[PDB]
């Protein structure tokens, strides 16, 4: 998942 995102880590934090 995105390891290096902090969207994407807010926002899933299923991913990474």
Same mark, same amino acid.
């Given at each position: 998942?995105? !390891?290096?995102?902090?969207? !994407? /880590?807010? /926002?899933?934090?299923?991913? !990474?």
């Amino acid at each position: 998942g995105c !390891c290096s995102d902090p969207r !994407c /880590n807010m /926002n899933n934090p299923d991913y !990474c």
